[PDB]
Amino acid sequence: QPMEEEEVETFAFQAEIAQLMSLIINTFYSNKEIFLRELISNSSDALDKIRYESLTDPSKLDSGKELHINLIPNKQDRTLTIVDTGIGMTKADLINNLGTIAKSGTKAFMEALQAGADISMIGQFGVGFYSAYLVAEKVTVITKHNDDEQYAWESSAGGSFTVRTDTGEPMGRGTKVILHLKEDQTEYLEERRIKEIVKKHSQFIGYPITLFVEK
């Protein structure tokens, strides 16, 4: 019954990453659907990493043998969740790779946009994760790596993100991206739309992908 206590750490995004997020959020782009391609591609890379690590150390699969991606639309919460059982990320990985450290592709990509380039090019510049903000007002990343505890990263943009130990349902290993969709982007909760986008953009994943549909 006693009051629970939880630690949170708040971080500022690196300057160019903050500028990138603002550009993605406040500019109109057609072809926003490519966000799902980018997230699935990141999952595939995380899956490749645990796969190859396990060839040399099979104990790394003690946290889960199955290597796959699950897509979970939730119309009640208005969330689309992409879950993989890839290598996952440590706390240090989250902090370094999801916000605080500069990427070499950020500037070149922003300038490419502000010249008319299609947003689809984002993955080539190594900042494809941020395409989530084309469709989501808030993104929560839950992750579990063999070498660390389970962590939750979250940002509604505006310049900062938080990291905390996750009190939610334990995952054996991997990463779960929860997209809290903007009110005008609920088409990405529809089964037909999700299937269309995966069929169009994500046909060479290398791992099984399953769509879970309520009701």
Ligand X SMILES: COc1cc2cc(c1)NC(=O)/C(C)=C/CC[C@H](OC(N)=O)[C@@H](OC(N)=O)/C(C)=C/[C@H](C)[C@@H](OC)[C@@H](OC)COC2
**Are 4 and 165 contacting, i.e. CB atoms less than 8 angstroms apart?**
no
Among positions 97, 100, 162, 186, the unique one binding ligand X when judged by CB under 6 A: 97
Within residues 146-185, the interface with ligand X by CB under 6 A covers 175, 177
166 binds, among ligand X, Mg ion, none (CB under 5 to 8 A by kind): none
147 binds, among ligand X, Mg ion, none (CB under 5 to 8 A by kind): none
Q: SS3 breakdown of the chain: % helix, strand, coil, rounded to 5? A: 40, 20, 40
Among positions 21, 80, 87, 194, the unique one binding ligand X when judged by CB under 6 A: 87
Stretch that binds ligand X, among 2-10, 106-114, 121-129, 193-201 (CB under 6 A): 121-129
105 binds ligand X (CB under 6 A): no
Among positions 13, 35, 109, 129, the unique one binding ligand X when judged by CB under 6 A: 129
Residues in Cβ contact with 33 at an 8 Å cutoff, skipping those fewer than 6 apart: 188, 197, 200, 201
Please provide the distance, in angstroms rounded to a whole number, between the alpha carbons at the two ends of the chain: 35
Question: Phi, psi at residue 82, to the nearest 5°?
Answer: -110, 120
44 binds, among Mg ion, ligand X, none (CB under 5 to 8 A by kind): Mg ion
Tell me whether residue 34 or residue 141 sits nearer to ligand X (CB atom). Answer: 141
DSSP string, 88-148: ---HHHHHIIIIIS--TTHHHHHHHHTTT--GGGGGGGT-GGGGGGGTEEEEEEEEE-TTS
85 binds ligand X (CB under 6 A): no
Within residues 23-52, the interface with Mg ion by CB under 5 A covers 44-45
Q: How far apart are CA 159 and CA 133, in angstroms?
A: 13
Secondary structure class of 154 (helix, strand, coil): strand
Binding positions for ligand X, rule: CB under 6 A: 39, 42-43, 45-46, 49, 84, 86-87, 89, 93, 97-98, 126-130, 141, 175, 177
